[PDB]
Amino acid sequence: AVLSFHNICYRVKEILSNINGIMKPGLNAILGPTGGGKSSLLDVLAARKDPSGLSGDVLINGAPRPANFKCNSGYVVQDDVVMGTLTVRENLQFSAALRLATTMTNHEKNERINRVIQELGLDKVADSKVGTQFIRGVSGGERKRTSIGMELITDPSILFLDEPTTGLDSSTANAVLLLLKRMSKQGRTIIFSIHQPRYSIFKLFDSLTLLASGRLMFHGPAQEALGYFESAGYHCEAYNNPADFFLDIINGDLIEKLAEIYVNSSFYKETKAELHQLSGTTSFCHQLRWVSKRSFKNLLGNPQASIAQIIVTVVLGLVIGAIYFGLKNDSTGIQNRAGVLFFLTTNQCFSSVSAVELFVVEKKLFIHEYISGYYRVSSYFLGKLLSDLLPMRMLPSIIFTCIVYFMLGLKPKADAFFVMMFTLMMVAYSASSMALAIAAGQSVVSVATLLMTICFVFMMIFSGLLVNLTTIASWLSWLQYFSIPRYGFTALQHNEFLGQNFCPGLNATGNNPCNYATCTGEEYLVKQGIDLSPWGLWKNHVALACMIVIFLTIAYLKLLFLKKY
């Protein structure tokens, strides 16, 4: 596996100049200051970057680079994206099930997993929970070892890291670079950038590249990496770090005069002499079923924002049941009976912000797993919102309805239960999908100010219970069609107020000089301005379903049109 590249003048203003070199099958490194091309040449050498502004020729083993390159390579990204709620073995089982083909068997796949575990030396922590400095089960070094082990299951013939030392102890950094030299002895070429190395980890490198501010300063083996600058008139001082001295040369202790010495060097010509000789998946159900399993296990790992929602739903169910237990077929009736229906509708207004972060907390993981070819965007999307839907959208409406009707008995049908439970599910899931679509990239004040403004306007003002909607002039009355709880309130009124008279032998209908001698619900739905046909019960459900589809399409398009490079 010989990765090669030639004159890659990457421009987005010209962040890389003309650059060429050959990545021999060893422990190739890329050094330099942070603002240079140390992290950009690595993304150019992987895909990891907009291929439009390349203007170069990256080439593997003589042939140019395929589009099927991120599926056969491996990019261990810098910030550890590994799941800090799963164990090591069920991180690697996940990556095995989504990177290895389904044609092979679970027996062979688990042999591959424990082969990688015994290779990387993870066996004493092969069932502890990985941590992210959130819940402590592993070290930092074994966490980095898991991030390396995930991109080894596919057996990559060419492996990319991205600063595999930063944020670590020097003992763990020396141990992980010794791990890379151990795993590099199978011919597996390893290419990485490093921030501020030391002379301990410098004999490890088979070849060495060095970029500064977009220019190439050196590309050759480390045994004459010092000899180049010792040929250019500089002197390595006594007991001085050479890798740090490479930076002390290029910080001014100009760079246009320092770059050209490599242009007229000997390794420029020897590199170009070989370089011109070189130049002349998985089924959808499987990805859905594994993403949903991973998110279920993550939700069991962090059940703190979910049992909080279950606790508040039980407390709200008990409170609204106790308030509604004091409502009978009496004179103190319909005006508070229409208040408890609004409470039943908007009982899940608090839980809408719990799904504001569903594709935001793991987006550095989503971008990496998508462009490494694990799953599709639609598959990740459906597998994630099939994992928030069951225990955080459908379950609290189940337990809220079974707590409300435990403190009750109003229409014994066992179908008013089902249509109420479906209405609460539709209202809760519609408001939660609105919080997915409308609020994604915002702060801690802005998300809650936004979701309380569209709790003011579209739940208290326009979902008309305390201003009658057929008095507003017809340029502000149209905003009642955008409000979630008006549909749920209408669908619960149409289920509550059908047939019952609420006045046991006290009609008094016909008191014309008086006011409001009307008590039945059939002459209350027309006063509220809502339908009486059975289409008037399901018009609200089809409107909420249209809102769910539109908000989930906005939440899907915000995932599809994400800069994944």
A 10 A CB-CB count for 315 gives 11
Task: State the minimum distance, in angstroms, from the CB of residue 81 to a second copy.
Answer: 20
Nearer to a second copy, 216 or 353 (CB): 353
Q: What is the DSSP letter of 4?
A: E
Q: Which two tokens stand for residue 263?
A: 């242009």
Task: State the minimum distance, in angstroms, from the CB of residue 119 to a second copy.
Answer: 23
Task: State the minimum distance, in angstroms, from the CB of residue 428 to a second copy.
Answer: 13
Task: State the minimum distance, in angstroms, from the CB of residue 38 to a second copy.
Answer: 13
Question: What's the rounded Cα separation, in Å, for the pair 526 and 239?
Answer: 92
DSSP assignment of 252-274 equals T--HHHHHHHHHTSHHHHHHHHH
Task: State the minimum distance, in angstroms, from the CB of residue 71 to a second copy.
Answer: 35
Query: Is 142 a known ligand-binding residue?
Result: yes
DSSP assignment of 96-129 equals HHHHS-TTS-HHHHHHHHHHHHHHHT-GGGSSSB
Interhelix angle 416-438/484-496, nearest 10 degrees: 180
Three-class DSSP category at 22: strand
Nearer to a second copy, 131 or 149 (CB): 131
Query: Is 136 a known ligand-binding residue?
Result: yes
* Paired sense of beta strands 189-193 and 158-161, if any: parallel
Task: State the minimum distance, in angstroms, from the CB of residue 111 to a second copy.
Answer: 34
Query: Is 195 a known ligand-binding residue?
Result: yes
Nearer to a second copy, 503 or 548 (CB): 503
Question: What's the rounded Cα separation, in Å, for the pair 220 and 421?
Answer: 69
Q: Which two tokens stand for residue 358?
A: 């569903």
Task: State the minimum distance, in angstroms, from the CB of residue 347 to a second copy.
Answer: 8
Query: Is 138 a known ligand-binding residue?
Result: yes
Q: Give which of 176, 159, 118, 138 is closest to 1, Cα–Cα.
A: 159
Query: Is 140 a known ligand-binding residue?
Result: yes
Query: Is 139 a known ligand-binding residue?
Result: yes
Query: Is 39 a known ligand-binding residue?
Result: yes
Q: Give which of 8, 5, 4, 6 is closest to 54, Cα–Cα.
A: 8
DSSP assignment of 62-75 equals TEEPPSTTTTTEEE
Nearer to a second copy, 93 or 352 (CB): 352
Nearer to a second copy, 231 or 553 (CB): 231
The CA dihedral of 129, 134, 135, 138, to the nearest 10 degrees, is 50
Question: What's the rounded Cα separation, in Å, for the pair 457 and 450?
Answer: 11
Query: Is 536 a known ligand-binding residue?
Result: no
Nearer to a second copy, 3 or 427 (CB): 427
CA 436 from centroid of its chain's CA atoms: 12
Query: Is 339 a known ligand-binding residue?
Result: no
Nearer to a second copy, 68 or 453 (CB): 453
Binding positions for ATP: 32-39, 136-142, 163, 195
Binding positions: 32-39, 136-142, 163, 195
